Structure formats: structure tokens, C-alpha cells
Tab-separated table of N, CA, C and O in Angstrom:
chain	number	residue	atom	x	y	z
A	1	UNK	N	0.653	-1.373	0.068
A	1	UNK	CA	-0.070	-0.130	0.135
A	1	UNK	C	1.690	1.527	-0.438
A	1	UNK	O	1.758	0.740	1.023
A	2	UNK	N	0.143	2.683	-0.748
A	2	UNK	CA	0.829	3.772	-0.713
A	2	UNK	C	2.284	3.944	-1.580
A	2	UNK	O	2.833	2.686	-1.920
A	3	UNK	N	2.351	4.671	-1.668
A	3	UNK	CA	3.776	4.729	-2.591
A	3	UNK	C	4.966	5.650	-2.065
A	3	UNK	O	5.460	6.470	-1.559
A	4	UNK	N	5.790	4.863	-2.602
A	4	UNK	CA	6.981	4.245	-1.206
A	4	UNK	C	7.991	5.396	-2.163
A	4	UNK	O	7.357	6.257	-2.318
A	5	UNK	N	9.054	5.626	-0.625
A	5	UNK	CA	9.065	6.634	-0.981
A	5	UNK	C	10.603	7.054	-1.170
A	5	UNK	O	11.362	5.851	-1.596
A	6	UNK	N	11.317	7.780	-2.651
A	6	UNK	CA	11.919	7.225	-3.546
A	6	UNK	C	11.617	8.508	-4.555
A	6	UNK	O	10.811	9.930	-4.866
A	7	UNK	N	12.707	8.277	-5.339
A	7	UNK	CA	12.847	9.173	-6.604
A	7	UNK	C	13.168	8.133	-7.744
A	7	UNK	O	13.839	8.142	-7.665
A	8	UNK	N	12.320	9.072	-9.630
A	8	UNK	CA	12.642	8.644	-10.471
A	8	UNK	C	11.984	9.215	-11.065
A	8	UNK	O	11.101	9.043	-11.143
A	9	UNK	N	13.097	9.788	-12.249
A	9	UNK	CA	11.875	10.507	-13.871
A	9	UNK	C	11.447	9.554	-15.165
A	9	UNK	O	11.571	8.027	-14.510
A	10	UNK	N	10.914	10.738	-15.801
A	10	UNK	CA	9.779	10.202	-16.122
A	10	UNK	C	10.479	10.823	-17.820
A	10	UNK	O	11.376	11.466	-18.028
A	11	UNK	N	10.706	9.531	-18.562
A	11	UNK	CA	11.473	9.286	-20.065
A	11	UNK	C	10.038	9.117	-21.204
A	11	UNK	O	9.034	8.851	-20.634
A	12	UNK	N	10.180	10.699	-22.543
A	12	UNK	CA	9.414	11.166	-22.822
A	12	UNK	C	9.319	9.575	-23.592
A	12	UNK	O	10.017	8.408	-24.309
A	13	UNK	N	7.716	9.574	-24.239
A	13	UNK	CA	7.496	7.658	-25.530
A	13	UNK	C	6.861	8.799	-26.480
A	13	UNK	O	8.106	8.023	-27.243
A	14	UNK	N	5.706	9.442	-26.855
A	14	UNK	CA	5.710	9.583	-27.809
A	14	UNK	C	5.076	11.757	-27.722
A	14	UNK	O	4.986	12.057	-26.492
A	15	UNK	N	4.633	12.061	-29.380
A	15	UNK	CA	4.237	13.375	-29.122
A	15	UNK	C	3.097	13.274	-29.418
A	15	UNK	O	3.190	12.888	-31.656
A	16	UNK	N	2.304	13.510	-29.441
A	16	UNK	CA	1.346	13.937	-31.023
A	16	UNK	C	0.673	14.997	-31.619
A	16	UNK	O	0.542	16.063	-30.373
A	17	UNK	N	0.754	15.227	-32.278
A	17	UNK	CA	0.176	16.540	-33.126
A	17	UNK	C	-1.391	17.207	-33.127
A	17	UNK	O	-1.605	17.951	-33.913
A	18	UNK	N	-1.987	15.736	-32.944
A	18	UNK	CA	-3.317	16.460	-33.112
A	18	UNK	C	-4.235	17.335	-32.570
A	18	UNK	O	-5.091	18.413	-33.488
A	19	UNK	N	-3.600	18.004	-31.453
A	19	UNK	CA	-4.025	19.396	-31.138
A	19	UNK	C	-5.479	19.628	-30.496
A	19	UNK	O	-5.636	20.928	-31.429
A	20	UNK	N	-6.137	18.472	-30.665
A	20	UNK	CA	-7.791	18.846	-30.051
A	20	UNK	C	-8.142	19.230	-28.722
A	20	UNK	O	-7.087	19.309	-27.805
A	21	UNK	N	-8.551	20.380	-27.975
A	21	UNK	CA	-9.391	20.654	-26.754
A	21	UNK	C	-9.447	19.509	-25.892
A	21	UNK	O	-10.317	18.916	-26.220
A	22	UNK	N	-9.003	19.325	-25.196
A	22	UNK	CA	-8.835	18.250	-24.137
A	22	UNK	C	-9.705	19.406	-21.865
A	22	UNK	O	-8.512	19.886	-22.469
A	23	UNK	N	-10.534	18.077	-22.034
A	23	UNK	CA	-10.902	19.611	-20.430
A	23	UNK	C	-11.779	18.099	-19.813
A	23	UNK	O	-11.774	18.506	-19.197
A	24	UNK	N	-12.193	16.810	-20.288
A	24	UNK	CA	-12.327	15.793	-19.441
A	24	UNK	C	-11.557	14.479	-19.187
A	24	UNK	O	-10.533	14.594	-20.314
A	25	UNK	N	-11.462	13.657	-17.904
A	25	UNK	CA	-10.701	12.091	-18.606
A	25	UNK	C	-11.592	11.365	-17.257
A	25	UNK	O	-12.685	11.478	-16.732
A	26	UNK	N	-11.514	9.865	-18.004
A	26	UNK	CA	-12.513	8.707	-17.015
A	26	UNK	C	-11.056	7.777	-17.540
A	26	UNK	O	-9.928	7.544	-18.484
A	27	UNK	N	-11.259	6.091	-16.997
A	27	UNK	CA	-10.478	5.769	-17.346
A	27	UNK	C	-10.964	4.498	-16.693
A	27	UNK	O	-12.662	4.128	-16.750
A	28	UNK	N	-10.890	3.268	-17.781
A	28	UNK	CA	-10.930	2.310	-18.353
A	28	UNK	C	-9.836	0.835	-17.698
A	28	UNK	O	-9.137	1.210	-16.261
A	29	UNK	N	-11.091	0.048	-16.990
A	29	UNK	CA	-11.064	-1.796	-16.269
A	29	UNK	C	-11.464	-2.533	-17.178
A	29	UNK	O	-11.565	-2.064	-18.435
A	30	UNK	N	-10.558	-3.691	-16.366
A	30	UNK	CA	-11.041	-4.993	-17.083
A	30	UNK	C	-12.252	-5.319	-15.690
A	30	UNK	O	-11.783	-5.536	-14.321
A	31	UNK	N	-12.768	-6.113	-16.717
A	31	UNK	CA	-14.508	-6.652	-16.011
A	31	UNK	C	-13.962	-7.776	-16.434
A	31	UNK	O	-13.757	-8.530	-17.691
A	32	UNK	N	-14.236	-8.865	-15.536
A	32	UNK	CA	-14.220	-10.213	-15.660
A	32	UNK	C	-16.234	-11.044	-15.489
A	32	UNK	O	-16.369	-10.707	-15.106
A	33	UNK	N	-16.513	-10.656	-16.661
A	33	UNK	CA	-17.805	-11.755	-16.806
A	33	UNK	C	-17.411	-13.761	-16.957
A	33	UNK	O	-15.862	-14.601	-17.550
A	34	UNK	N	-18.688	-13.605	-15.510
A	34	UNK	CA	-18.152	-15.347	-15.687
A	34	UNK	C	-20.344	-15.999	-15.654
A	34	UNK	O	-20.277	-14.892	-15.337
A	35	UNK	N	-19.749	-16.721	-15.135
A	35	UNK	CA	-21.031	-17.017	-14.586
A	35	UNK	C	-21.532	-16.509	-12.973
A	35	UNK	O	-22.469	-16.380	-12.420
A	36	UNK	N	-20.347	-16.658	-12.597
A	36	UNK	CA	-20.454	-16.193	-11.812
A	36	UNK	C	-21.068	-14.209	-11.635
A	36	UNK	O	-22.228	-14.339	-10.386
A	37	UNK	N	-21.569	-13.294	-13.022
A	37	UNK	CA	-21.811	-12.297	-12.693
A	37	UNK	C	-22.483	-12.746	-14.416
A	37	UNK	O	-21.728	-11.787	-15.107
A	38	UNK	N	-23.766	-12.871	-15.179
A	38	UNK	CA	-23.988	-13.139	-15.932
A	38	UNK	C	-24.981	-12.536	-16.480
A	38	UNK	O	-25.310	-11.228	-15.307
A	39	UNK	N	-24.952	-12.475	-17.484
A	39	UNK	CA	-26.357	-11.345	-18.328
A	39	UNK	C	-26.014	-10.139	-18.588
A	39	UNK	O	-24.394	-10.118	-19.670
A	40	UNK	N	-26.160	-9.122	-19.003
A	40	UNK	CA	-26.451	-8.326	-19.703
A	40	UNK	C	-24.730	-6.610	-18.705
A	40	UNK	O	-24.561	-7.522	-17.062
A	41	UNK	N	-24.500	-6.055	-18.623
A	41	UNK	CA	-23.713	-5.425	-18.326
A	41	UNK	C	-24.135	-4.500	-16.751
A	41	UNK	O	-23.074	-4.167	-16.221
A	42	UNK	N	-26.030	-4.881	-16.589
A	42	UNK	CA	-25.906	-3.829	-15.927
A	42	UNK	C	-25.842	-4.874	-14.224
A	42	UNK	O	-25.476	-4.166	-13.395
A	43	UNK	N	-25.852	-6.553	-14.176
A	43	UNK	CA	-24.810	-7.268	-13.203
A	43	UNK	C	-23.775	-8.166	-13.367
A	43	UNK	O	-23.203	-8.349	-12.756
A	44	UNK	N	-23.457	-7.333	-14.633
A	44	UNK	CA	-22.011	-8.211	-15.213
A	44	UNK	C	-20.625	-7.175	-15.293
A	44	UNK	O	-20.677	-6.959	-15.662
A	45	UNK	N	-20.983	-6.651	-13.911
A	45	UNK	CA	-19.069	-5.971	-13.535
A	45	UNK	C	-18.796	-6.199	-12.283
A	45	UNK	O	-19.843	-6.293	-10.839
A	46	UNK	N	-17.628	-6.704	-11.574
A	46	UNK	CA	-17.399	-6.203	-10.327
A	46	UNK	C	-15.783	-5.391	-10.460
A	46	UNK	O	-15.247	-5.072	-11.476
A	47	UNK	N	-16.066	-4.906	-9.438
A	47	UNK	CA	-13.886	-3.692	-9.157
A	47	UNK	C	-13.174	-4.942	-8.754
A	47	UNK	O	-13.029	-4.249	-10.312
A	48	UNK	N	-12.812	-5.123	-8.741
A	48	UNK	CA	-11.592	-5.858	-8.740
A	48	UNK	C	-10.022	-4.717	-7.472
A	48	UNK	O	-10.297	-3.719	-7.362
A	49	UNK	N	-9.045	-5.189	-7.132
A	49	UNK	CA	-8.345	-4.906	-6.404
A	49	UNK	C	-7.407	-3.871	-7.487
A	49	UNK	O	-7.121	-4.596	-8.543
B	1	UNK	N	-6.498	14.551	-58.619
B	1	UNK	CA	-6.880	16.064	-58.296
B	1	UNK	C	-6.216	15.999	-56.935
B	1	UNK	O	-6.820	15.835	-55.805
B	2	UNK	N	-4.947	16.476	-56.251
B	2	UNK	CA	-4.609	16.872	-55.274
B	2	UNK	C	-4.815	18.362	-54.327
B	2	UNK	O	-4.288	18.805	-54.788
B	3	UNK	N	-5.973	17.192	-52.210
B	3	UNK	CA	-6.091	18.960	-52.797
B	3	UNK	C	-5.860	19.051	-51.437
B	3	UNK	O	-5.555	18.284	-50.202
B	4	UNK	N	-4.831	20.151	-51.084
B	4	UNK	CA	-4.287	20.605	-50.048
B	4	UNK	C	-5.110	21.917	-48.839
B	4	UNK	O	-6.466	21.342	-49.811
B	5	UNK	N	-4.713	22.060	-47.812
B	5	UNK	CA	-5.980	22.969	-46.942
B	5	UNK	C	-5.036	22.966	-46.005
B	5	UNK	O	-3.791	23.609	-46.079
B	6	UNK	N	-5.843	24.631	-46.690
B	6	UNK	CA	-4.609	26.383	-45.973
B	6	UNK	C	-6.277	26.461	-44.468
B	6	UNK	O	-7.029	26.598	-44.130
B	7	UNK	N	-5.996	26.699	-43.179
B	7	UNK	CA	-6.545	26.855	-41.626
B	7	UNK	C	-5.469	27.024	-40.734
B	7	UNK	O	-4.223	26.548	-40.567
B	8	UNK	N	-6.022	26.824	-39.827
B	8	UNK	CA	-5.450	26.632	-38.364
B	8	UNK	C	-4.947	25.207	-37.795
B	8	UNK	O	-4.655	25.414	-36.413
B	9	UNK	N	-4.400	24.261	-39.001
B	9	UNK	CA	-3.617	23.345	-38.608
B	9	UNK	C	-2.330	22.458	-38.155
B	9	UNK	O	-2.319	24.135	-39.245
B	10	UNK	N	-1.728	21.732	-37.562
B	10	UNK	CA	-0.591	22.210	-38.254
B	10	UNK	C	-0.305	20.805	-39.233
B	10	UNK	O	-1.174	20.385	-39.234
B	11	UNK	N	0.691	20.907	-39.964
B	11	UNK	CA	0.767	20.253	-41.426
B	11	UNK	C	1.274	18.880	-40.551
B	11	UNK	O	1.792	18.287	-39.764
B	12	UNK	N	0.844	17.853	-41.997
B	12	UNK	CA	0.621	16.193	-41.217
B	12	UNK	C	2.038	15.476	-42.113
B	12	UNK	O	3.089	15.155	-41.733
B	13	UNK	N	1.146	15.343	-43.609
B	13	UNK	CA	1.862	15.298	-44.825
B	13	UNK	C	3.654	16.062	-44.566
B	13	UNK	O	2.988	16.731	-45.454
B	14	UNK	N	4.202	15.734	-44.783
B	14	UNK	CA	5.756	16.703	-44.277
B	14	UNK	C	6.655	15.648	-44.981
B	14	UNK	O	6.830	14.776	-45.501
B	15	UNK	N	8.046	16.206	-44.709
B	15	UNK	CA	9.392	15.675	-44.822
B	15	UNK	C	9.980	16.750	-46.099
B	15	UNK	O	9.689	16.934	-47.267
B	16	UNK	N	10.845	17.195	-45.926
B	16	UNK	CA	12.375	17.617	-46.516
B	16	UNK	C	12.651	16.856	-47.239
B	16	UNK	O	13.724	18.109	-47.902
B	17	UNK	N	13.488	15.567	-47.347
B	17	UNK	CA	14.287	15.051	-47.793
B	17	UNK	C	15.970	15.934	-47.364
B	17	UNK	O	16.522	15.558	-46.597
B	18	UNK	N	15.817	16.126	-49.004
B	18	UNK	CA	17.440	16.746	-48.665
B	18	UNK	C	19.061	15.579	-47.811
B	18	UNK	O	18.605	15.327	-46.615
B	19	UNK	N	20.057	15.720	-49.325
B	19	UNK	CA	21.140	14.908	-48.352
B	19	UNK	C	22.282	15.728	-48.558
B	19	UNK	O	22.622	15.663	-49.819
B	20	UNK	N	23.253	15.807	-47.884
B	20	UNK	CA	24.546	15.923	-47.722
B	20	UNK	C	25.386	15.639	-47.375
B	20	UNK	O	24.920	15.473	-45.924
B	21	UNK	N	26.518	15.179	-47.042
B	21	UNK	CA	27.664	13.954	-46.421
B	21	UNK	C	28.627	14.881	-45.480
B	21	UNK	O	27.888	16.040	-44.950
B	22	UNK	N	29.243	14.491	-44.831
B	22	UNK	CA	29.269	14.879	-43.015
B	22	UNK	C	30.830	14.521	-43.664
B	22	UNK	O	31.720	13.553	-44.221
B	23	UNK	N	32.150	15.844	-43.327
B	23	UNK	CA	32.986	16.152	-43.114
B	23	UNK	C	33.497	15.915	-41.171
B	23	UNK	O	33.313	16.725	-40.259
B	24	UNK	N	34.664	16.289	-41.405
B	24	UNK	CA	35.621	16.009	-40.114
B	24	UNK	C	36.288	16.971	-39.777
B	24	UNK	O	37.642	16.830	-40.921
B	25	UNK	N	36.966	17.470	-39.037
B	25	UNK	CA	38.678	17.275	-38.562
B	25	UNK	C	38.128	18.799	-39.022
B	25	UNK	O	39.408	19.360	-40.054
B	26	UNK	N	37.195	19.538	-39.866
B	26	UNK	CA	37.647	21.621	-40.991
B	26	UNK	C	36.128	21.826	-40.503
B	26	UNK	O	35.326	21.224	-40.175
B	27	UNK	N	36.872	23.390	-39.634
B	27	UNK	CA	36.040	24.257	-39.922
B	27	UNK	C	34.456	23.976	-40.749
B	27	UNK	O	34.692	24.070	-42.324
B	28	UNK	N	33.347	23.958	-40.549
B	28	UNK	CA	32.673	24.570	-41.397
B	28	UNK	C	31.178	24.935	-41.232
B	28	UNK	O	31.040	24.613	-39.957
B	29	UNK	N	29.335	24.991	-41.806
B	29	UNK	CA	29.206	25.185	-40.730
B	29	UNK	C	28.258	23.553	-41.884
B	29	UNK	O	27.617	22.939	-42.381
B	30	UNK	N	26.732	24.421	-39.795
B	30	UNK	CA	26.422	22.728	-40.431
B	30	UNK	C	24.799	22.933	-40.005
B	30	UNK	O	24.049	23.906	-39.376
B	31	UNK	N	23.697	22.236	-40.174
B	31	UNK	CA	22.167	23.001	-40.160
B	31	UNK	C	21.743	22.032	-39.985
B	31	UNK	O	20.656	20.945	-40.564
B	32	UNK	N	21.841	20.888	-38.135
B	32	UNK	CA	21.781	19.437	-38.640
B	32	UNK	C	19.898	19.582	-38.352
B	32	UNK	O	19.143	18.602	-39.173
B	33	UNK	N	19.412	20.439	-37.801
B	33	UNK	CA	18.057	20.548	-37.405
B	33	UNK	C	17.238	21.046	-36.700
B	33	UNK	O	16.517	21.524	-36.595
B	34	UNK	N	18.166	22.027	-36.976
B	34	UNK	CA	17.883	23.541	-37.032
B	34	UNK	C	18.443	24.445	-36.395
B	34	UNK	O	18.888	26.306	-37.257
B	35	UNK	N	18.993	24.094	-35.412
B	35	UNK	CA	20.594	24.208	-35.487
B	35	UNK	C	21.809	24.612	-36.522
B	35	UNK	O	21.555	23.857	-36.506
B	36	UNK	N	22.328	26.219	-35.610
B	36	UNK	CA	23.358	26.520	-37.014
B	36	UNK	C	24.653	26.825	-36.329
B	36	UNK	O	24.500	27.100	-35.453
B	37	UNK	N	25.928	26.091	-36.139
B	37	UNK	CA	26.384	26.855	-35.627
B	37	UNK	C	28.331	26.449	-36.953
B	37	UNK	O	28.252	25.580	-37.312
B	38	UNK	N	29.308	27.016	-36.327
B	38	UNK	CA	30.207	26.478	-37.338
B	38	UNK	C	31.721	26.027	-36.270
B	38	UNK	O	32.153	26.224	-35.487
B	39	UNK	N	32.411	25.410	-36.706
B	39	UNK	CA	32.873	25.354	-36.299
B	39	UNK	C	33.670	22.830	-36.732
B	39	UNK	O	33.224	22.965	-37.621
B	40	UNK	N	34.711	22.775	-36.356
B	40	UNK	CA	35.169	21.340	-36.254
B	40	UNK	C	34.171	19.584	-36.026
B	40	UNK	O	34.032	20.434	-34.318
B	41	UNK	N	34.466	18.742	-36.786
B	41	UNK	CA	32.921	17.800	-35.971
B	41	UNK	C	34.813	16.698	-36.183
B	41	UNK	O	35.291	16.048	-36.540
B	42	UNK	N	34.876	16.300	-34.523
B	42	UNK	CA	35.484	14.627	-34.101
B	42	UNK	C	34.835	14.253	-33.421
B	42	UNK	O	33.089	14.304	-32.801
B	43	UNK	N	34.992	12.413	-33.508
B	43	UNK	CA	34.326	11.482	-32.576
B	43	UNK	C	34.610	11.743	-31.494
B	43	UNK	O	35.360	11.686	-30.552
B	44	UNK	N	33.054	11.571	-30.693
B	44	UNK	CA	32.994	11.222	-29.224
B	44	UNK	C	32.685	10.007	-28.386
B	44	UNK	O	32.090	10.015	-29.017
B	45	UNK	N	33.037	10.329	-27.306
B	45	UNK	CA	33.395	8.982	-26.529
B	45	UNK	C	32.127	9.596	-25.448
B	45	UNK	O	31.833	8.269	-25.034
B	46	UNK	N	31.664	10.832	-25.356
B	46	UNK	CA	30.071	10.625	-24.573
B	46	UNK	C	28.999	9.720	-24.726
B	46	UNK	O	29.108	9.587	-26.185
B	47	UNK	N	28.397	9.464	-23.741
B	47	UNK	CA	27.057	8.576	-24.911
B	47	UNK	C	25.740	9.246	-24.480
B	47	UNK	O	25.804	9.199	-23.009
B	48	UNK	N	24.839	9.597	-24.686
B	48	UNK	CA	23.534	10.515	-25.176
B	48	UNK	C	22.630	8.990	-24.253
B	48	UNK	O	22.487	7.757	-24.693
B	49	UNK	N	21.521	9.721	-23.802
B	49	UNK	CA	20.113	8.868	-23.858
B	49	UNK	C	19.693	8.970	-25.448
B	49	UNK	O	19.909	9.390	-25.649
B	50	UNK	N	18.621	7.105	-24.857
B	50	UNK	CA	18.499	7.185	-26.874
B	50	UNK	C	17.047	8.552	-26.628
B	50	UNK	O	17.159	8.014	-27.773
């Protein structure tokens, strides 16, 4: 748990010339669909650690 | 018909090409990537990050 006490620099990966207007932010996750939570997206949804 | 576009958007299709050889140990003008200067170019042992 919790971010450890340390230092680490961050190296660039990509640069995008898209130039669109950005205002909002949301994150995706992985959903476990099986016999435990069958059906549509109403009931087939779990959080997970 | 190849249609361009003139607007306030950055250019996507580009590429200047151009090519000249490299010389060493001679004072010469260079324009690598926009930067310009005069001097001699020698092999260096310093290591850059990728």
C-alpha cells in the first residue's frame, strides 16, 4: 500500500500533433465476465483490486 | 486532384528530404535540425540517452 519514498525520472514516449481540445478525464478497467456475474452489463460488473 | 488545406491546423504530410555528406576535422557550417554553427566535428566518447 501507498507510494514508496523514492525518486525516479520519467522518459518521454510519444508526441502527438493532434491538437484537439481536452477537458475531461476518465479511466477504463478490466471486467470479469463469467458464471458469477452473468447477463448484461447491469449485473456483470465487479471492481477487483 | 491533390487537394491541400490552408487553415489553423498543424501540417501532417511533410518531409523535407535533402541530403549532404559529413566531413570531419574541418571548420564547416552545419544545419543538423535547425541549429546552426561553425566548427570542427570529431568523434566523441560521451554516451547519450536514447
